[PDB]
Structure formats: structure tokens, C-alpha cells
Design a protein around this ligand. Structure first.
Ligand code: HEM
Ligand code: HEM
Lengths: 363, 362
């Protein structure tokens, strides 16, 4: 299909079909004035309604007064909506502003330091995020560029990441995508069709303790670099032993098919799948919605490439934290490094044409 | 999703329809052994035949000996060829090695300094380049990665540039793409069907004075930063005056349709199209084939944005040089800065399955 509806009980871009491309941006707030910030949220919501339907923002990209700047910067003219979704989230640091300190959710927990972390503070944190997903990267970039422009004077862009998954024009919808290590990635995940599993593991409930967040979720972002040239010198057996699945079919060891359920005892004790599996973590289960990246080459000639990992969950303390803690001895650690991090509370959806992003928090 | 044929009188990736994604790499050579370098060119050619057909390199991505590394890194398994083209070029610095000094073509000229240039030396130059273009970014990264792996110990990556979306056209029958300033870019180019114009302006000929380059071309690459804060506060009229075309349709000033011919005297004297047009430059004409980029933020609260400009021509001295010199007074200069530069000789095509990249030189 061509467009994804913007309105709902939940924000789109979480349980809705995974699009081919990502532009993720974190913003910092520069105003102290609550009223001015609320005004921005309303203007952003109006723009998002236009963008997700394939229309220009405000009065358009051309045809207005010649002596005024155009309302829309124009680089998406002639393109389709491209299944664009725009998903907003609020960082812990937002809650030190506007008198919000007592409304920070307990489920919006600060992450501990994990072994091997090497976080760049410039590419970590942020007061706000917008996740822009679409099948055409120019559609996603146009959205971020215009939201940043509307917000100028009240917010700045802290850090930005481009990503890619599959190319849907050429690649069947049911084929699992491969990551840049060459392994199928996504086999055992929560799918958007699994209503009950979403209620149990992804959406915040009223009884969880923070009423304004009912129908929202909690997001963890990790920029994870791969040591590509080291990995490529490893033997085939070493690579398969790191994961506990074979590289060609992606079946669990001792099984024949990708979707065969794993027998954890046949994998090495520090294999990634064995450590990450819910049965190893008291039942803890995540929705993964991440994207590959390749940014260029670094000063030594090496490929700057990896996984921009995104996980959604009902509570950070019972989702990402236990699972990542259990990866302390993962065989994969030799070939990766976490170099950026942030956490966000993703509010409930925009109910109808008169609602706006953050209305349950701000009133 | 289809394959583009690899063999021909010319390399693919020039007159070919422009693909959605770019991965460009420049390499420096680290061996002094001519025979070892020739062996690398042959192994690279064999890999390129596989990659452009959607097959894995060497003996494949899996099912070999458990105790050896796979020949192919595996991340393009199950993907279509996706119009992958691989185009190789040789930089001026290459000709200081392997006894090649007297074979350097005259048409491979060093560029002069241009006013406004702020060139980063680390993201400029290179002994050789590979341009990988495809509709799928994973297919393009896979090709560059596997070529670099095969070359370990003989070549190193100097610098690379990814392009997320095209800003050029060799197919006038299809929609012209927009750059990040919001204007159509590629209306008046050279089309892949225009055989006469390609022979006059793009392909090198025997009589030009370097026999080994017959059927090849010359490439200029310029990395250009865009001052999008400054641009986004300009009025609509200011933006249109800079180019000489309207923003919505992309028609020449005063006309109704994109593809109507420009009437240059109705444009401002410093308009980009007026200064760049062949009629303003003694007939000099280019094949433009560039892509947009964004590499994160600038550290000052804004998105970074630019255009990786690529031009092909029969002689650098009669193509890019005169046109860029004429852009000294361009109104666009207020909004852009050139921050990287490289030139390359692009050899002729790989004729058949016994031929190899660079065979006419070596
Ligand atoms: C570059 C980093 C990573 C790579 C390359 C990677 C790769 C993979 C692969 C190939 C699988 C098996 C196929 C599948 O079920 O998806 C897998 C499964 C999984 N990964 Fe990772 N992963 C990475 C990081 C992480 C992180 C940071 C977490 C959580 C903190 C995580 C959690 C999981 C989970 C929960 C599973 C599914 C296990 C199961 O239920 O069978 N992964 N990963
Ligand atoms: C960021 C840099 C640039 C931008 C945004 C830009 C934009 C444009 C636009 C919008 C057009 C009109 C549509 C078309 O015919 O393609 C154009 C035309 C053209 N540009 Fe540029 N351009 C840039 C840099 C350059 C450079 C560096 C050169 C060559 C040195 C160049 C050469 C041309 C030529 C030859 C034309 C066609 C003129 C004609 O025959 O009508 N441009 N450019």
C-alpha cells in the first residue's frame, strides 16, 4: 500500500509494517517557556498530518508571495507518501523543564553502564526524538528537515542517523532481511499482527502507574558498530557458533528450517541466541525494529557500518535491561561495540483531527 | 531488479539510466609489484562479473570448508542484481608507479584552484576509484566491501562517499529528481540514447592522442556542502533568480514547461543556468551523474547536507574546467562550498569474458 493512517489509539511506526528506510533524529529544547513548547507540538502535529499524506507543509513549496520564504522546502514534490510514519518520544532530560519532574514515568529508567560500552556523548541522549520511516529516503529526510525548520529557535538537532533494511520493490515481503554480518535478522520477534503479545510486552497500561502514558511505549536506541574486517576473517564455523544458527538457511543448530523452534542446549553456552532468548531471561520479550547503517569509512580505511538497534517495550526495567545484562559474556562482543545510546517515552496516539502530540502530558 | 550487462565497448555506469543509490570508493595502491597489481585487476574483474549478475564471489557465501572464511561475506544472499554497475577509474597519482609515467593522458589534467575552494586533502585524490551504483544500498555496500577484501595487502580505501538519492538524469522520458535545495536537477543533460552527443562530448577517441583510452572517459568528482540554513530563509523569488528556472515546474523563466528551451537573456546575468549553459561556454557540454548526501549533524544544531557532484567528459580541459571557471560569478556560490575533489581516467569497456579492467594500459 501507499499510506499509513496517522491517527489512532497508538502512534504509528511501532506495530505498523516495517518500511525500507529510516531517518532518526534526536532534538534538544532551547526554550524555557511551557506555552511556547506546547505551541510547537501543535504546529508539528499539523505538519505531520500533511507529511504522512504526501502533502507539503503549511501553504506549500511554491505559488505563495514571491518575497516570502516557502513554507515547505520542496525536495519531496512529485514523490508519493511512501508509507511515511512519524513517531515522537520524550527523553528523561525533558522532565527537568516546564515543571514536569513528578510526571517522569518510573518505567523510563536510566540505563546502567554495560561492560564494553564506549558511548560518544555527542551521539547519545536528547530531550526529544522523531523516528521517520518510509520506503523512499528522500521522503524521510524531507520530513526531518522541515520539522527542524519549523522548530528553529525552540529546538536544535542534537544527532541524526540514516538507516536501511530491505528494498521492497525487489525483495519479497515475507523474506527475513539479513544484517551486515550476513545473518538473517528478525526470525523470532514480536510481529504487528500479535495483538495480545503487544498488550503484554509493548504497550503501557493504565495500571502500570503513569496514566498519561496509557497506550504509549518505551524506546531504547543503541548505535552498534560492527568490526567488519575482523568478522570477515573469521571461519564459517566460528560465525555460526557465535549465533547458534547456520548462515545459509538461518536454522537453529540441529534443525533444518529457519522457523524451527530452537533447542538451546545444542548451542554453545555463550551463543547470542541462547543468551537473548526469553527462556534465558525469565520470559522477557522485546519488539525489535532496528535498521542497518553504513556511514562511510573512518581514518584507518575501515567501514563505519553496523546496526542502529531499536527496541520497544512496556517497561525498560523488564525488557531491554535484563536481556542486555545477560549478553555480558556473548560471543558476539568480540565483533561489536555500542557507541551511542538513548531512551525515550513514546506517548499514546493522536486520537483525531483536534488532538496533538503530547496532549495527555501537557493537558 | 534486472541486471545491467557488464561487457561492452564502454564501461556501464555512465550512459546507463541513473540508479537510486551510490557507494563511491577511492583507493590508494600499496604494492610496488606490477605483476601483483595486474593479478588484482583480473581477480576484481572476475568478481565484478559475479556481483553484477547477482551471484556471490568465488566459491560462495556458505557450504565451503567449516574452518575457512567464506569467499563472499553473504549480506546480499537472496537479493536481485538491482541494476548494479561497477565503474573503475585511474587517478593521476597512479602513473608515478609501475613505469607508467609516459602513458598518463594529456586529457587527465590537474584542476586549477577555484575561488571559494576549501578542499580537505584527506577526502580528495586517490590512485583509483570504484563507483558502485544500484537501486538497493545493501547490494552496493556488499560490492565495495568484497572488492576491498579481495584487495587486502595491495590497495587500501583512502576515502568513501555514500549517496542516498540521485540528483541526475540520463533518461529524459522519466521524472527529473530534485536536489536538497528543492529544484529539479538533470533536465538538460545528455541522454543514454543520444549516441552522437556521447561520441562528441563523453567518449575519448583514438585521434585525441592516447590510444589506450579509446572508448573511455574522464571523471571529475566534487564534494559540495550546501548552506541550508542560509537557503531556507531566502525568499521564493531569490531562489528562482539564483537558477533561472521556477521551483514548481522547473521551467525556464517566462516559460510554462520544464523541457521548453531556455531563453538566456530573460535570466539574471549571474543565474546558474545562464552561466553553465553550453552556449555561454563555447559549446562545452557535460554528462552530470551526481547524488545527494547527508552525514549526520554539523555539531551546531543543524542537519548536514550536500551534493556529491560527478561529471563525465571527453577531455577535462574542454569540459568541467571552462564551465567551472565561468561559474566564478554564479549567484549559487552564496549557498555552497566545494570541500573535496578528485579526477580519474575511466578506461574502455571489458570486451568479453577473456578481457580485464585496465588491459589496454597494462
Ligand atoms: C549488532 C548487534 C546485533 C546483531 C548483529 C544481532 C543479531 C541477531 C541475530 C542474527 C539473531 C537471530 C535471528 C533472530 O531471531 O532475529 C538475533 C536474535 C535476537 N537478538 Fe540479537 N543482534 C544484535 C544485538 C542485540 C541486542 C543489543 C539485543 C538485546 C538487548 C538483541 C536481542 C536479540 C533477541 C531478543 C533475539 C531473539 C532471540 C530468540 O528469541 O530466539 N540483539 N540477533
Ligand atoms: C550544489 C551544486 C549545484 C546545484 C544545486 C545545481 C543545480 C542545478 C539546477 C537546478 C540546474 C537546472 C536543471 C538542469 O538542467 O539540470 C542545473 C543545471 C546545470 N548545472 Fe548545476 N548545480 C550545481 C553544481 C554544478 C556544477 C559544479 C556544475 C559544473 C561545473 C554544474 C553544471 C550544470 C549544467 C551544465 C547545467 C545545465 C545547463 C543547461 O545546459 O541548461 N552545476 N544545476
Amino acid at each position: 500500500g501507499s499510506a499509513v493512517p496517522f491517527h489512532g489509539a497508538h502512534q504509528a511506526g511501532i506495530a505498523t509494517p516495517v518500511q525500507d528506510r529510516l531517518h532518526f533524529a534526536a532534538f534538544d529544547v532551547t526554550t524555557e517557556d511551557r506555552a511556547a513548547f506546547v505551541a510547537l507540538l501543535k504546529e508539528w502535529t499539523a505538519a505531520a498530518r500533511r507529511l504522512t499524506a504526501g502533502h507539503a507543509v503549511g501553504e506549500g513549496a511554491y505559488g505563495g508571495l514571491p518575497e516570502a520564504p516557502p513554507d515547505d522546502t520542496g525536495e519531496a514534490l512529485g514523490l508519493k507518501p511512501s508509507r511515511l510514519t512519524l513517531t515522537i518520544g520524550f527523553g528523561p532530560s525533558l522532565f527537568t523543564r516546564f515543571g514536569l519532574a513528578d510526571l517522569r514515568p518510573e518505567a523510563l529508567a536510566d540505563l546502567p553502564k554495560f561492560p564494553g560500552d564506549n558511548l560518544d556523548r555527542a551521539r547519545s541522549g536528547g530531550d526529544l526524538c522523531v523516528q521517520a520511516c518510509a520506503d523512499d529516503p528522500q521522503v524521510a529526510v524531507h520530513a526531518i528537515r522541515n520539522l527542524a525548520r519549523i522548530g528553529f529557535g525552540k529546538v536544535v538537532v542534537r544527532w541524526s542517523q540514516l538507516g536501511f533494511g530491505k528494498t521492497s520493490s525487489t525483495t519479497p515481503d515475507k523474506q527475513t532481511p539479513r544484517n551486515l554480518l550476513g545473518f538473517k535478522d528478525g526470525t523470532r520477534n514480536i510481529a504487528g499482527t500479535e495483538k495480545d503479545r503487544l498488550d503484554r510486552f509493548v504497550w503501557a497500561a493504565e495500571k502500570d502507574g503513569t496514566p498519561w502514558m496509557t497506550g504509549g511505549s518505551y524506546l531504547v536506541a543503541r548505535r552498534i558498530r560492527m568490526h567488519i574486517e575482523t568478522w570477515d576473517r573469521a571461519s564459517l564455523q566460528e560465525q555460526e557458533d557465535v549465533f547458534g544458527r547456520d548462515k545459509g538457511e538461518g536454522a537453529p543448530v540441529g534443525k533444518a528450517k529457519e522457523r524451527d523452534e530452537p533447542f538451546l542446549k545444542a548451542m554453545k553456552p555463550d551463543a547470542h541466541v541462547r543468551l537473548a532468548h526469553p527462556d534465558s531471561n525469565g520470559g522477557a520479550t522485546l519488539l525489535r525494529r532496528g535498521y542497518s547503517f553504513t556511514d562511510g569509512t573512518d581514518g584507518l580505511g575501515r567501514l563505519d557500518a553496523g546496526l542502529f538497534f531499536l527496541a520497544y517495550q512496556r517497561d525498560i526495567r523488564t525488557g531491554f535491561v535484563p536481556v542486555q545484562r545477560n549478553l555480558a559474556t556473548d560471543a558476539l562482543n568480540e565483533y561489536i561495540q555500542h557507541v551511542g545510546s538513548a531512551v525515550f517515552a513514546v506517548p499514546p496516539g493522536v486520537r483525531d483531527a483536534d488532538d496533538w502530540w503530547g496532549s495527555t502530558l501537557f493537558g
